[PDB]
Structure 1
């Protein structure tokens, strides 16, 4: 995309940190392929749950996580840009239907893994509700970055507020039965792909796991650590 377009969707200081502002020929070439491979899979009407769609969507997320600099605020902005910018199709070829295809295929990549850990009843619930709150995660993760940046205490009311927001999003697709929720923790301990495309750093994750440990700590029974 042209520089005039990022210039109206990002403040000046934001452009100092956004890799898309950099004129990199290899990044430009990568995105041409990614956008071209998506457009071809769409032209073929490729199902979202097929390996080609899964492999492409995984490549998209990795490239977005790098080219937003792991800043969820910038993913959020790019999402707003694609759906509202008049010159999105012309300057990038990216359309809302393409972004919906990549997002659904990336979801399929994880449902594909969860299918091996959840029974069909649990799995039907997740596939049913996966998209209900999906778009609310970027703003939460950004607050997790901000709360970790500002050295907030995971046990403070402010921090326990964030662990509540997380539990809301988590339970939205995982359910409310502890037996089912722990199949999810097991999968995440065994499946590196379940953590991809979450704009989480080791540090932010370490902060959230503390905040969730305080929230879920039981008076008796093995504590967390």
Structure 2
């Protein structure tokens, strides 16, 4: 879209590190392709769980991660913009229904993988509750980036607050059975896609794993590390 649209959704400081504010002909072409291909799939009434939808959704999320420079606050801002900006459709062709389709297809791309790791009742719980708190993740990841950026101790009260927030979001879709949660950890160790579209860097993930280890540490038994 236009630089005027971005100017009213981002401050001047933010625009200096938002890649979308760069004029780049190849970035623009890729977005024309991603939007055009989404609209075509919707026009064919393509199911979100077909491979064509899964592929396109994966391409979108990787592009969005690059074009927000990995900043979850910027993903949040673009999410606000898509739903509120009056000339979103005229300027970009993006509609709330398109974003819903892409998000549902991206969910299906992960549920297809979890189907190989979970039994039937665990997979049904995760499908049912997948979206319950999905939208709370960007604000948590933003706070995780901030904790890591500010060198907060993962064992501080604020650090454990973040680990507790993570647990509540994770348990929202994984359930609360320790046996089931270990399947999710194994899957995440083996399946690189499950960590895509989370706006986590290696450093922030390391910070979170440390805070979780403190939270979950047992008095007896093999400890974390």
For Structure 1 versus Structure 2, the TM-score category normalised by the shorter chain is: over 0.9
User: Does the residue aligned with 2:220 lie in a helix, a strand or coil?
Assistant: coil
* 2:161 aligned partner: 161
Give 5+ residue unaligned stretches, structure 1: none
Determine the C-alpha separation between the residues in 2 that align with 1:88 and 1:46.
23
1:177 — aligned with what?
Answer: 177
How far does residue 99 in structure 1 lie from its aligned partner after superposition?
A: 0.2
- Could you list the runs of 4 or more consecutive aligned residues of structure 1 that deviate by over 4 angstroms after TM superposition? none
- Shift in Å at residue 192 of structure 1? 0.1
Q: State the Cα distance separating 1:20 from its structure 2 match.
A: 0.3
- Aligned counterparts of 1:153 and 1:161: Cα–Cα separation in 2: 12
In the TM superposition, residue 137 of structure 1 has moved relative to its aligned partner by 0.2
Q: Distance in 1 between matches of 2:21 and 2:139?
A: 22
Number of residue equivalences: 225
State how far apart, in whole Å, the 1-side matches of 2:87 and 2:147 are: 35
CA distance in 1, matches of 2:45, 2:216: 44
How far, CA to CA, are the matches of 1:15 and 1:21 in structure 2? 6
Alignment partners' CA distance in 1, 2:224 and 2:27: 42
Return the offset for 1:219. Answer: 0.4
Matches of 1:148 and 1:87, distance apart in 2: 37
Q: Which runs of 5+ in 2 are unaligned?
A: none
C-alpha displacement of 1:73? 0.1
Residues 48-72 of structure 1, C-alpha deviations (whole Å, 9 max, x = no match): 0000000000000000000000000
TM-score by length of 2: 1.00
Q: Secondary structure at the match of 1:128?
A: helix
Equivalent position SS for 2:48: coil
In 2, the alpha carbon distance for the partners of 1:34 and 1:42 equals 12
Question: How far did residue 88 of structure 1 move?
Answer: 0.3
Q: CA RMSD, aligned part only?
A: 0.2
Q: Residues 152-176 of structure 1, C-alpha deviation per residue, up to 9 Å, x if partnerless?
A: 0000000000000000000000000
TM-score computed with the length of structure 1 as normaliser? 1.00
